[PDB]
Amino acid sequence: REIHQDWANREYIEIITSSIKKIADFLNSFDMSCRSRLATLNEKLTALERRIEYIEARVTKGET
Amino acid sequence: GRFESEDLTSIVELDGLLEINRMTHKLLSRYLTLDGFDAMFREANHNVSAPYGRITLHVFWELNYDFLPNYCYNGSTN
Ligand SMILES: [Cl-]
Numbered sequence: 001r002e003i004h005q006d007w008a009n010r011e012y013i014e015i016i017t018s019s020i021k022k023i024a025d026f027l028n029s030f031d032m033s034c035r036s037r038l039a040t041l042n043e044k045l046t047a048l049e050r051r052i053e054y055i056e057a058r059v060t061k062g063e064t
Numbered sequence: 065g066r067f068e069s070e071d072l073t074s075i076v077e078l079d080g081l082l083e084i085n086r087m088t089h090k091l092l093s094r095y096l097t098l099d100g101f102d103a104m105f106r107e108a109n110h111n112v113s114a115p116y117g118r119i120t121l122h123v124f125w126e127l128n129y130d131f132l133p134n135y136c137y138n139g140s141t142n
Contacts, residue, residue, distance in 0.1 A: 047097050054103050054112065062113040 066117065072126040078119070 067078045090099045111117030
């Protein structure tokens with residue numbers, strides 16, 4: 001009867017909620033992974049900017 | 065700066081200390097991204113925007129003021 005349909009309805013609900021949690025999980029672990037990647041990119045870029053400043057100064061006169 | 069406050073004989077001590085700093089940079093570079101050791105050194109030595117660094121200039125300073133007037137060469141011991 002209506003309880004048997006309720007069991008089917010809540011199983012369906014369980015499947016959708018489970019899938020939503022899987023999307024959330026992915027979103028969180030994607031954020032974390034990109035945070036690392038952006039940190040690594042900033043690290044290398046900062047160094048490359050510093051190196052250029054240095055090399056330029058080897059070829060250019062100072063301020064009076 | 066320590067070199068600049070001492071006579072020419074202290075240059076050996078300087079060299080040892082510079083080598084410890086080089087090792088320090090190397091140990092730190094395993095985990096951190098730092099400016100190259102040579103770049104760091106040339107900057108500290110004021111040898112980036114100038115042709116002769118502080119070490120070179122202090123050597124001549126000490127030659128002129130201490131080594132030439134105060135030293136006695138022994139040809140047998142060199
Ligand atoms: Cl010392």
